[PDB]
Amino acid sequence: SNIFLELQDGDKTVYTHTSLIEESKQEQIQAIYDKVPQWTNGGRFLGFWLSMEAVNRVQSVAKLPIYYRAGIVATSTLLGGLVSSLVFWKSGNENQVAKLANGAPVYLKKWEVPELSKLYFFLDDDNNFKPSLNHHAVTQGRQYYKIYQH
């Protein structure tokens, strides 16, 4: 699960990463991002079906150049997918991921967001060889912005 999130902390627009969230919730987020293309592809079919049913059965658009008839179906195809993506996110999903990110650290700038799977760590002999971020080349700390609340 390698996904960068953009959350709204009131007026602020903050950023985080799914790797900074417990694995129990990374699955719920990944499952949401996995249903988007099925809502996108599903909407492209309707926009393609409804458009093809109109440019042919309606004897007002059928009496037009094929290029105009093909542009309507093409425009209605991708447009039907964008509408489905909005209804998917705006309905209850865009607010659900924010709830799933409750407790995760956030940052003001996307460039400050680390990927936990990309950080350097070592096995601390003084702590039963547990993995530690506080390696012998560390100086100051991490100092994120705040914990997300929703």
Ligand X SMILES: CCCCCCCCCCCCCCCCCC(=O)OC[C@H](COP(=O)([O-])OCC(O)COP(=O)([O-])OC[C@@H](COC(=O)CCCCCCCCCCCCCCCCC)OC(=O)CCCCCCCCCCCCCCCCC)OC(=O)CCCCCCCCCCCCCCCCC
Q: Which helix (H) or strand (E) holds 35?
A: helix 23-57
Nearer to ligand X, 58 or 119 (CB): 58
Is 115 one of the binding residues for another protein (CB under 8 A)?
Answer: yes
> Segment contacting ligand X (CB under 6 A): 19-27, 41-49, 103-111, 116-124?
41-49
The answer for residues whose C-beta is within 8 angstroms of residue 77's C-beta and 6 or more apart is 44, 47, 48, 51
Is 55 one of the binding residues for ligand X (CB under 6 A)?
Answer: yes
Which residue from 8, 15, 10 is spatially nearest to 145, judged by alpha carbons? 15
Residue that the structure tokens 């460039």 belong to: 111
Is 11 one of the binding residues for another protein (CB under 8 A)?
Answer: no
- Which of another protein, ligand X, none lies near 66, with the C-beta cut-off 5 to 8 A by kind? ligand X
> Segment contacting ligand X (CB under 6 A): 68-76, 83-91, 104-112, 129-137?
68-76
Select from 77, 84, 88, 113 the one that contacts ligand X (CB under 6 A). Answer: 77
Q: Which helix (H) or strand (E) holds 106?
A: strand 105-106
The C-alpha angle 118, 120, 126, rounded to 5 degrees, equals 140
The contact mask relative to another protein for 22-61 (x = CB under 8 A, - = no) is xx--------------------------------------
Nearer to ligand X, 19 or 84 (CB): 84
The C-alpha angle 89, 5, 98, rounded to 5 degrees, equals 55
> Segment contacting another protein (CB under 8 A): 40-48, 77-85, 91-99, 110-118?
110-118
Nearer to another protein, 7 or 72 (CB): 7
